């Protein structure tokens, strides 16, 4: 499913991402826009052979199992396909583990290069939250 901007903001708020580990909602909406264009079904293969899945592009080397990433962990204990659902619960729950790992939202390259240090509240302006 392709979310609208405010529809995803509201879904993220309901699943407890707003100010999670100090990152306001706009940071999460900006990261999803630039990682997946708000498409839950987005995938992209990396040179190391791992793949990134779903609205927040969560990687199979560490976080999920896709059966084709040798030596990977599965720290979120889920098949990577669960991250492609129209229900973002599994992606949110795994993103809370990633953001708690030490580097905060710098784990998401698009957030660090396109959202960090910008006016991220713009991403939630206008929405009924
Ligand atoms: Cl980037």
The DSSP secondary structure of 22-38, one letter per residue, reads TB-HHHHHHHHHHHHTT
Contact (Cβ atoms closer than 8 angstroms) between residue 111 and residue 105: yes
DSSP β-bridge partners for residue 79? 65
The DSSP secondary structure of 49-88, one letter per residue, reads S-EEETTTTEETTTT-B-S-STT---TT-SBGGGGGSSS-
DSSP 23: B
How many domains in the chain?
1
Q: How many Å apart are CA 107 and CA 113, to the nearest integer?
A: 11
Binding site per annotation, positions: 101
How many residues are listed for the chain in this entry? 129
Main-chain phi, psi angles of 46, to 5 degrees:
-100, 160
The yes-or-no answer on residue 52 being catalytic is yes
Q: How many Å apart are CA 72 and CA 20, to the nearest integer?
A: 27
Q: Tell me the chain's radius of gyration from C-alpha atoms.
A: 14
Residue carrying the six token digits 């699943």 = 15
H or E segment and range at residue 44? strand 43-45
Binding site per annotation, positions for substrate: 101
Main-chain phi, psi angles of 20, to 5 degrees:
-65, 120
Contact (Cβ atoms closer than 8 angstroms) between residue 99 and residue 105: yes
The tokens describing 97, both together, are: 């583990």
Cα angle value 65/23/58 (rounded, 5°): 15
Host domain of residue 28: 1-129
Exactly one of 7, 35, 48, 66 is catalytic; which is it?
35
Task: Give first-to-last CA distance, the chain, whole Å.
Answer: 21
3-class secondary structure, 52: strand
Domain CATH number, residue 23: 1.10.530.10
**What is the DSSP pairing of strand 51-53 with strand 43-45?**
antiparallel
Ligand 1 centre and the CA of 92: distance in Å?
21
Experimental method: X-ray
Contact (Cβ atoms closer than 8 angstroms) between residue 80 and residue 44: no
3-class secondary structure, 99: helix
Ligand 1 centre and the CA of 93: distance in Å?
23
CB atoms within 10 A of CB 116: 16
Exactly one of 52, 66, 87, 119 is catalytic; which is it?
52
Ligand 1 centre and the CA of 48: distance in Å?
17
H or E segment and range at residue 45? strand 43-45
């Amino acid at each position: 499913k392709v979310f609208g901007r405010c529809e995803l903001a509201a879904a993220m708020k309901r699943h407890g991402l707003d100010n999670y580990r100090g990152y306001s909602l706009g940071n999460w909406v900006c990261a999803a826009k630039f990682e997946s264009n708000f498409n839950t079904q987005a995938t992209n293969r990396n040179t190391d052979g791992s793949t990134d899945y779903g609205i927040l592009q969560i990687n199979s080397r560490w976080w999920c199992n896709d059966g084709r990433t040798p030596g990977s962990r599965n720290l979120c204990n889920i098949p990577c396909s669960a991250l492609l659902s129209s229900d973002i619960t599994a992606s949110v729950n795994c993103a809370k583990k990633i953001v708690s790992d030490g580097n905060g939202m710098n784990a998401w390259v698009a957030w660090r290069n396109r959202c960090k240090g910008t006016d991220v509240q713009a991403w939630i302006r206008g929405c009924r939250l």
